[PDB]
Amino acid sequence: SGWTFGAGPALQIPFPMQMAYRFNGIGVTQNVLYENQKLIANQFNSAIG
């Protein structure tokens, strides 16, 4: 639910959508995430590993 559960009821949203929203938060726009989603997922998995 992203940040929505920190305000009221949890708002079920897809994770790619939430990540694109987070990118929009820092002035990167959604297109970057939706064009690099595989790279971002791989980088996140490598960092978590």
Binding site: I13, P14, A20, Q30, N31, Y34, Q37
Partner: protein
């Protein structure tokens, strides 16, 4: 995540894409307000092969009828 009108992903400049089952709209994040998906509220940047989960739908040009 995006809408493919003619081989081009249309992402929403502010807000998310929603569909009431059949018709897709653009609404804000913290309040449901459906708006017809035009070129004003959507910016096109992509190829429509890389994004995953893109729906086709259609966009409305506010200048073509005029």
């Amino acid at each position: 995540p995006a809408i493919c009108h003619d081989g081009k992903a249309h992402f929403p400049r502010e807000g998310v894409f929603v569909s009431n089952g059949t018709h897709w709209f653009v609404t804000q994040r913290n309040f449901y307000e459906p708006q017809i998906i035009t070129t004003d509220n959507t910016f096109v940047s992509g190829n429509c092969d890389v994004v995953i989960g893109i729906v086709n739908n259609t966009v409305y040009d506010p200048l073509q009828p005029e």
